[PDB]
Design a protein around this nucleic acid. Sequence first.
RNA 1: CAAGGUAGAGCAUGGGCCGGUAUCCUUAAGGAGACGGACGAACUGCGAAUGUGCUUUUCUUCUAUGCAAGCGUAGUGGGCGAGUUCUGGUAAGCAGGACUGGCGAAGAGGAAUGAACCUGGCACUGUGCUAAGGAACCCAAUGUCUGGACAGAGACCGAAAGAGGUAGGUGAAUAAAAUU
Lengths: 156, 170, 176, 217, 92
Amino acid sequence: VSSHGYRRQTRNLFSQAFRKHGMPNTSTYLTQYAVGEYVDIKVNPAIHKGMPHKYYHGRTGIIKEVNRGSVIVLFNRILANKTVERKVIVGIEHIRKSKCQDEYLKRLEINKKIIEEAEKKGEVPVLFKRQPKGPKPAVEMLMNNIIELSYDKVES
Amino acid sequence: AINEYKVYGIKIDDNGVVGDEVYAHIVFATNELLAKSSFNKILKKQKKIKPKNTKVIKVEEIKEDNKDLDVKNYGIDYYYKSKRCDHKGYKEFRGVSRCHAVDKLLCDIGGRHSVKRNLIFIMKVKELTVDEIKKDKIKIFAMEDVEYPAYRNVLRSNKLFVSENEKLFN
Amino acid sequence: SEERMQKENKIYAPKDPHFYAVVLIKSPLRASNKIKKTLELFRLKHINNCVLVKNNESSRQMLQKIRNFVAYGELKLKTLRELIYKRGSCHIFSEKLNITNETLEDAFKNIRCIEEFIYELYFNDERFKELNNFLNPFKLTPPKGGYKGRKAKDIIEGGAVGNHQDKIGELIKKMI
Amino acid sequence: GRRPGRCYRYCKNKPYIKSRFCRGVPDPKIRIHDLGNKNAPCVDLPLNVNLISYSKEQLSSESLESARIAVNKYMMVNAGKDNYHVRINVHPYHILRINKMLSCAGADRLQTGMRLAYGKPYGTAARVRFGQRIISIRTKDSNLKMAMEALRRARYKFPGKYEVQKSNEYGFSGIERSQFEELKNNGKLINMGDHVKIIKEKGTVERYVKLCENAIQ
Amino acid sequence: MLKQKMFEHYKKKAILFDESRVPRTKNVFYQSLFSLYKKVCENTENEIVHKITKRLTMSRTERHPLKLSNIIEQANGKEIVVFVGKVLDDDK
RNA sequence: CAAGGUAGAGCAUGGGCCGGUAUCCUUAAGGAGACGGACGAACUGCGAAUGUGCUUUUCUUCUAUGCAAGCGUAGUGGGCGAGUUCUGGUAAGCAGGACUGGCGAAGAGGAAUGAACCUGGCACUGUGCUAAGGAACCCAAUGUCUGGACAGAGACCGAAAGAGGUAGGUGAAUAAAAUU
């Protein structure tokens, strides 16, 4: 039978990668955080204070409050077939800034131009949506340089 | 019945006609969809272009003339998959078309080796003169030297019961 | 065009069409919930239903999941006409109705006869959503003369499900 | 005595090896793997013949020992001691278990039936897969028909299908005969007993020179 | 285009009277008043009339009462106020 | 856009099997060895497919005969089976988990018969058509073409090991019809 301590089953998780042992780099400490940013959790096994519980490893959430050397992040979780919000305390050594909003922020920068012109000249924005890839395109071909294919390889 | 088709196709990426080459393939199959299927199969095994990066530009049927139904000799090079491995071989047939020759091979191997038609691959089909014939089977029929009588009886009428004194067969 | 092209030793291959046609061949009652949800989003509900779908990368991945239940392919104009004329019908919101001049004029302010409808549906890409979502799913009969093999095998294997390409017209023409 | 071979034929369980976790294991019956003229140079015994598996199963250490004796006795009588080398390729690392139970059962203080059923070590076997080389011979080219007949005798000691086949390779090198001759002439080979090392244009020049003075030619 | 058309339809249908609801009281004076409003609803789209007709069908507990001062507090500068319920005195 | 260490692949720290040329150390034995072959549920240097989460309707597609906070209150808390996989056991219509549909609580047509298999989800009538499975007769609908096969065989049916008969493929010879 299995046990139920705070760091159960973390032999693979919570171990350093090959040729990457030691303390964190300066960039870790010089990064500034703000309320409302999206942030991503990855535990560093060498630091023993401010570690989250291993369920949260590799998950992304939103910063709710900022303190001297730690952050409070909001998560959601299913328990007993219902949704529950959870507020997780994490030290700054175990977090990295998330990339999940990157494309959306670029798109907002384009929208922000159009939405002004749409008051002056038009009435409503064109709004620049994405579209999924359509059907295969048409082609005009010169028809020299033909290559033949054959079952010449007998494959003993 | 079996037919002969020739399929043509090119590579495409996020943009068109990414290579200036065109690829071709002659195939014996029952219809166009079974033809297109074979083209995809060969491209992926001899090169590495998967369907999402290909486009077929043309499919054409190939047909002979032979208004007088003249009889010709053909040799065929083939392989098939068994339980052990892949088996190569050569056999000779007679007929009024390349497709008539090919349908007789497919029937033969199914009869002799218990194989479904999709596990047989044709490598080459060649039309031959009397001096070219290698194996024993067709040579007597090619040199025009055969007559034989009828072994099977044939019914005279569609009726189920007939009078004892009537003629029954042929 | 074909003459001009051949007269200069060149081949022309047109762009793939904007929509596929889908027919529900076999029963979904034991499929998983993920399959059932996908069929709902394509508006397919009973055996021998037929429906039109936009050719697009999202649609092509939905079809990959349901390919063992459905026959699909591309439809030229002659067969599209026989379908709409012999089995077409429409709806406003919860009212089901026959395609008539009054109902077109009401729904689409500039389409007035059933021939203009078919023309826009085939040739104008940017109105497809509005034009398609007006038609109810087509209710077809089983094919005349039956199916030749075990219909649950792939078309390549000699059954009836999968991609029939340019040749779905032959299945639909036996089912109108 | 022993249980019949059908009890332990197929590879049902995960590998299980002698280790800190598993103690009180008996020694395997096979202990000797090479026979004949072990250190004969690669060039001197060109022909290679193998027993090959057409099955996926476990081979007991008792069966491997019986086959060794069978193959060796034949070659020794017919080929002569200095003309051949035999190798048995597979090693019996897997441990089998038994859940031993009393004959006078039904009632005892010992925990009877399927209570606490995990077994104790019983013996050992080798685990084998399709297309694997189980026994290998190298000899003179005159001894083809002899080597064939030697390996035939092993085929009756193991469960399942096995075939005797002749190789393209020179000796216990991995090199096809055609290619070997083409490298031997032109000076590229160094002898290392039963196999060869290939000289390449890779290191420092003074090492290259020192290697080449040692070549087989 | 279509997504907007759809939502604007749902929003409307969420306001309009259901026409398969009826008050449970055996009071014939109350049932008279409902009949008037019902016949007005089927000849109009005006949201105030629809809201009133839906509220006459709700239970005694759903028709919770208000005090005079709270009406004035919620009147937000209007002259006429309407309330499907009973108005009580505020002693303050 | 994140996280993961299974299948495959490998044997660089740790465990661990057999044999080694030159060379080296002693002996005049043995040992070491520039290397090859064989391996681990508690070995890893590399690493899938499928599955999981985050953002965006400023992203396709569907959507009101639809969702639904809150309040009151029922039954249930012996389960069993199929497909894919796993652990204990010589195994078991055996004992115990995981994932997606069932029978329980599911009729109808088909596998001669069968809780769970194939087709396919039931208000009540009438005319047409198909599925699965069939088409000498029992019993509604049957015939055709091409090869094999002779055993009171097969259509329903057991192993390692094998000769005999016959149909074909490939590779060796010899040839004054062919033959091995």
